Amino acid sequence: PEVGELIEKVRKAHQETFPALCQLGKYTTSEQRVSLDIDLWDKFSELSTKCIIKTVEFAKQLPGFTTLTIADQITLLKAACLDILILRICTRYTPEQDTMTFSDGLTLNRTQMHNAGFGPLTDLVFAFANQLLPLEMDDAETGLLSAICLICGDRQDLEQPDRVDMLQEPLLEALKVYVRKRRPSRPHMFPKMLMKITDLRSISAKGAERVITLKMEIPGSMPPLIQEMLEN
Amino acid sequence: SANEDMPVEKILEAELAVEPPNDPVTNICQAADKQLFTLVEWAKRIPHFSELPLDDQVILLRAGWNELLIASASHRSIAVKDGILLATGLHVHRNSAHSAGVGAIFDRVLTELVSKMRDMQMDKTELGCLRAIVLFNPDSKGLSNPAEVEALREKVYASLEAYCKHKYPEQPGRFAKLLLRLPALRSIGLKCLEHLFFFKLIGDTPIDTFLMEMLEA
Ligand SMILES: CC1(C)CCC(c2cnc3ccccc3c2)c2cc(C(=O)Nc3ccc(C(=O)O)cc3)ccc21
Ligand SMILES: CCCCCCCC/C=C\CCCCCCCC(=O)O
């Protein structure tokens, strides 16, 4: 009913801020595992920046997000960015080729993903990307999981956490019904998908640890921007 | 036959069955140790757990004991305020935590766990279920038959939601609201491992070794 519009809305928000793997024309570039490939890192760092921008536009598209204190908006976005990038990139995984494709089509394989910055978290993220395959998620499901993940009333320094919890309620309902409508005989698929947020949290945690490392071994690597971008 | 597979009452039973020098480090260590000693007992009473292969049982526990303990202590502190009531009965105020370097974890337990459980009045059955879900971790490393484990985790999912529909019909999304605690339990559980250098549990005896003994007996 009013849930269908919510679903429709979120799928469009996602579709519009994250093209689908099956629609991307790919492109590339022997090598082996090395500490870091600065030239790969430059493209990756670039694409990431762009995706963060896209993630912010996505959030703004989410029903009621904007009607939240700007401080709250920034806080939720700062807390869930890596989460969403990781979830996003992992939904661009081609198992037969063991590759991950970017929003511009750039397709990297494990070693390249490793050398581009994944470093030690490489096998980690790739395993998670694989755990997602059985879920056979679609646009609406990825968008909903992203929103449920972003609009989290647990994040500290939240002005109106209650308002956040209120905003997430419908998302969880929409995901529950939609997921189960699509997979009629497998009802456990809803908690299964939902609980991926747990694994995603574990990865982004270490992810942020690597992020500080890199911010050090690379001069002027990753300037802050959600805060500022959001304000303007 | 949802509950038939994973009897909510038989889980609540394990919850209750195991139901519980003075300084922060000492208090938490002693509280942790005490619960650690009865964790096998608890797990054993969780439907089908004892039927799994032993070498697997040790893997499931060593993987979620920290989260399992934080879950129980969190719920147990719903009553108290600005602190955590240990299994030893001692109340540890957040100022005590900040005194032992774990002030950040603490505030997080308090606001993301304790206070959320209190606010939704998570009953003892639900907490027990969540713990069971945390027990049957299908991703634990070195698992003999993960599929069997994930299958059981899925059964608890099935039971728990059934239960929430029964007991709280007016709350269609209580099930989800409940599960969303697991993510935060993991975050907090991870941050807690980093402090094990200073909080020496079970006389520094390696966890998995101690667990093995408890089980084999
Ligand atoms: C391993 C780790 C944590 C290292 C650093 C990093 C990262 C994060 N934020 C940035 C912000 C600005 C510049 C570089 C950055 C690099 C990062 C980013 C990702 C990720 O999926 N981002 C990402 C997701 C999607 C796309 C796209 O569709 O085009 C591009 C990048 C995954 C893991 C890591
Ligand atoms: C889970 C025990 C981990 C102990 C090391 C972490 C440092 C302490 C940080 C937060 C304390 C959380 C309270 C856990 C006590 C569990 C035992 C009890 O049930 O009383």
From Swiss-Prot, chain A:
Origin: domain of life: Eukaryota
Effect caused by changing residue 56 to A: Abolished ubiquitination and degradation by UBR5
Modified residues (Phosphoserine): 35, 185
Main location as per UniProt: nucleus
Tissue: Expressed in monocytes.
Required for binding corepressor NCOR1 as annotated region, ranges: 220-232
Chain span(s) of sequence motif 9aaTAD: 224-232
Result for mutant: residue 185 to A: No effect on heterodimerization with RARA. On ATRA treatment, localizes to the nucleus, and increased protein levels
Residues annotated as domain NR LBD: 2-232
Subcellular location(s) of the protein: Nucleus; Cytoplasm
One Gene Ontology cellular component: RNA polymerase II transcription regulator complex
GO biological process, one term: positive regulation of binding
Post-translational modification comment from the UniProt entry: Phosphorylated on serine and threonine residues. Phosphorylation does not change during cell cycle. Phosphorylation by AKT1 is required for the repressor activity but has no effect on DNA binding, protein stability nor subcellular localization. Phosphorylated by PKA in vitro. This phosphorylation on Ser-35 and Ser-185 is critical for ligand binding, nuclear localization and transcriptional activity in response to FSH signaling.
Stated induction or repression of this protein's expression: Expression is induced ba retinoic acid. Down-regulated by aging. Induced by pulsatile shear stress.
Record location of the Glycyl lysine isopeptide (Lys-Gly) (interchain with G-Cter in SUMO) cross-link: 215
Keywords recorded for this protein, A-Z: Chromosomal rearrangement, Cytoplasm, DNA-binding, Isopeptide bond, Metal-binding, Nucleus, Phosphoprotein, Proto-oncogene, Receptor, Transcription, Transcription regulation, Ubl conjugation, Zinc, Zinc-finger
Disorder: Chromosomal aberrations involving RARA are commonly found in acute promyelocytic leukemia. Translocation t(11;17)(q32;q21) with ZBTB16/PLZF; translocation t(15;17)(q21;q21) with PML; translocation t(5;17)(q32;q11) with NPM. The PML-RARA oncoprotein requires both the PML ring structure and coiled-coil domain for both interaction with UBE2I, nuclear microspeckle location and sumoylation. In addition, the coiled-coil domain functions in blocking RA-mediated transactivation and cell differentiation.
The protein's assembly and partners: Heterodimer; with RXRA (via C-terminus); association with RXRA is enhanced by pulsatile shear stress. Binds DNA preferentially as a heterodimer. RXRA serves as enhancer to induce RARA binding to RARE. Interacts with RXRG. Interacts with coactivators NCOA3 and NCOA6. Interacts with NCOA7; the interaction requires ligand-binding. Interacts (via the ligand-binding domain) with PRAME; the interaction is ligand (retinoic acid)-dependent. Interacts with AKT1; the interaction phosphorylates RARA and represses transactivation.
Similarity annotation: Belongs to the nuclear hormone receptor family. NR1 subfamily.
Protein name: Retinoic acid receptor alpha
Phylogenetic classification of the source organism: Eukaryota, Metazoa, Chordata, Craniata, Vertebrata
From-to range in the entire protein, with total length: 182 to 416 of 462
From Swiss-Prot, chain B:
Inducers of expression: Down-regulated by infection with viruses, such as VSV, HSV-1 and MHV68. Down-regulated by aging.
Keyword Zinc part of the UniProt annotation: yes
Keyword entries, A-Z: Acetylation, Cytoplasm, DNA-binding, Isopeptide bond, Metal-binding, Mitochondrion, Nucleus, Phosphoprotein, Receptor, Transcription, Transcription regulation, Ubl conjugation, Zinc, Zinc-finger
GO molecular function: chromatin DNA binding; DNA binding; DNA-binding transcription factor activity; identical protein binding; nuclear receptor activity; nuclear steroid receptor activity; RNA polymerase II cis-regulatory region sequence-specific DNA binding; RNA polymerase II intronic transcription regulatory region sequence-specific DNA binding
Positions bound to 9-cis-retinoate: 76, 87
GO biological process: angiogenesis involved in coronary vascular morphogenesis; camera-type eye development; cardiac muscle cell differentiation; cardiac muscle cell proliferation; embryo implantation; gene expression; heart development; heart morphogenesis
Compartments where located: Nucleus; Cytoplasm; Mitochondrion
Cellular-component GO terms for this entry: mitochondrion; nucleoplasm; nucleus; RNA polymerase II transcription regulator complex; transcription regulator complex
PTMs per UniProt: Acetylated by EP300; acetylation enhances DNA binding and transcriptional activity.
Tissues in which the protein is found: Expressed in macrophages (at protein level).
NR LBD domain sequence ranges: 3-217
Domain of life from the UniProt record: Eukaryota
Phenotype upon loss of function: Reduced myelin debris uptake by bone marrow-derived macrophages. Conditional knockout in myeloid cells results in reduced myelin debris clearing by macrophages, delayed oligodendrocyte progenitor cell differentiation and slowern remyelination after induced focal demyelination.
Annotated region described as Required for nuclear export, given as residue ranges: 108-128
Binding site for all-trans-retinoate: 76, 87
Protein family (similarity comment): Belongs to the nuclear hormone receptor family. NR2 subfamily.
Subunit: Homodimer. Heterodimer with RARA; required for ligand-dependent retinoic acid receptor transcriptional activity. Heterodimer with PPARA (via the leucine-like zipper in the LBD); the interaction is required for PPARA transcriptional activity. Heterodimerizes with PPARG. Heterodimerizes (via NR LBD) with RARB. Heterodimerizes with NR1H4; the heterodimerization enhances the binding affinity for LXXLL motifs from coactivators. Interacts with coactivator NCO6. Interacts with coactivator NCO3. Interacts with coactivator FAM120B. Interacts with coactivator PELP1, SENP6, SFPQ, DNTTIP2 and RNF8.
Domain description: Composed of three domains: a modulating N-terminal or AF1 domain, a DNA-binding domain and a C-terminal ligand-binding or AF2 domain.
Protein name: Retinoic acid receptor RXR-alpha
The gene coding this protein: Rxra
Residues included from the entire protein: 230 to 462 of 467
